[PDB]
């Protein structure tokens, strides 16, 4: 009965739902899930140990959602995802991290910064800046892509492994 509850956050509008879908389906889609039946659970092997990975998608309002409000309050873990071709996508996570940081001034919660389309030449300033941005916020940076580059899945595993260590 081992379950890991990780909350999905990141740029608003890119495709947080799609990244959740491709985890459970093993395929990248454009269709997004409705607030109803948004969050999913998936049986996975992490750290060599078989466990249940619970991916929490937000529902309804930004400020009023049990999927964020309840689970984030626990602080078990959450993933920050953004679009590498979207300049503004950085800002959304910057708000999330700095705001959560104030809440987590006394708490132990794993964080990972993930940028997509790392196989796509058409993107913002080199991801090296995203690493520097991640470093300024004291968090690791993972590269992912819908194309080939695996990041999101490994990043969620990293969050779980960080839970296993802490």
């Amino acid at each position: 009965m081992t379950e890991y509850k990780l909350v999905v956050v990141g740029a608003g509008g890119v495709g947080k739902s799609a990244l959740t879908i491709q985890l459970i389906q093993n395929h990248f889609v454009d269709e997004y899930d409705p607030s109803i039946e948004d969050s999913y659970r998936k049986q996975v092997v992490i750290d060599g140990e078989t466990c249940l990975l619970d991916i929490l998608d937000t529902a309804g309002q930004e400020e009023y959602s049990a999927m964020r409000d309840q689970y984030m309050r626990t602080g078990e873990g959450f993933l920050c995802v953004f679009a590498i071709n979207n300049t503004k996508s950085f800002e959304d996570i910057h708000q999330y991290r700095e705001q959560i940081k104030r809440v987590k001034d006394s708490d132990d919660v794993p964080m990972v910064l993930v940028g997509n389309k790392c196989d796509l030449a058409a993107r913002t300033v080199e991801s090296r800046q995203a690493q520097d941005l991640a470093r300024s916020y004291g968090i690791p940076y993972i590269e992912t892509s819908a194309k080939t580059r695996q990041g999101v899945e490994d990043a969620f595993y990293t969050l779980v492994r960080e839970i296993r260590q802490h």
Side-chain angles (χ1 to χ4, degrees):
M1 290 179 68
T2 299
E3 180 177 1
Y4 296 97
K5 297 168 177 183
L6 300 178
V7 178
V8 181
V9 298
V14 173
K16 73 186 303 183
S17 178
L19 294 178
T20 298
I21 291 168
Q22 68 89 21
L23 290 170
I24 63 172
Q25 297 299 316
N26 290 334
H27 184 72
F28 288 90
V29 299
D30 296 306
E31 183 178 0
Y32 304 110
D33 292 313
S35 291
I36 297 170
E37 296 179 3
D38 51 352
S39 300
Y40 292 99
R41 293 171 177 167
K42 185 78 176 185
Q43 183 176 0
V44 296
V45 178
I46 301 172
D47 200 45
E49 185 174 301
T50 302
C51 65
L52 181 66
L53 178 62
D54 184 352
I55 305 300
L56 278 312
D57 291 349
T58 58
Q61 302 298 306
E62 184 62 48
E63 295 299 305
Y64 306 100
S65 179
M67 296 299 99
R68 183 180 71 80
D69 289 341
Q70 181 182 277
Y71 291 83
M72 190 66 73
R73 183 174 177 185
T74 298
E76 198 166 312
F78 63 92
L79 187 66
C80 298
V81 300
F82 70 93
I84 201 65
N85 67 301
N86 187 342
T87 298
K88 292 179 178 180
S89 67
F90 280 100
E91 290 176 355
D92 285 351
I93 291 173
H94 291 176
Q95 290 165 170
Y96 278 121
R97 196 273 182 280
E98 290 172 358
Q99 179 186 270
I100 291 169
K101 179 180 178 181
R102 290 177 179 178
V103 173
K104 299 301 179 193
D105 283 346
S106 298
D107 200 0
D108 182 351
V109 58
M111 304 182 195
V112 176
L113 178 68
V114 178
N116 72 4
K117 298 182 202 168
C118 292
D119 297 321
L120 178 65
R123 64 184 185 271
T124 62
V125 170
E126 186 59 287
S127 67
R128 290 177 180 176
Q129 192 203 200
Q131 291 166 173
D132 287 347
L133 288 170
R135 286 174 180 175
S136 70
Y137 288 117
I139 60 174
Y141 176 70
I142 301 296
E143 291 184 304
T144 196
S145 176
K147 186 175 181 180
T148 54
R149 188 69 183 281
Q150 301 297 297
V152 171
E153 182 177 1
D154 287 347
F156 275 121
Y157 295 178
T158 297
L159 289 171
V160 169
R161 293 189 83 203
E162 285 298 306
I163 293 167
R164 292 174 65 81
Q165 292 161 171
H166 299 190

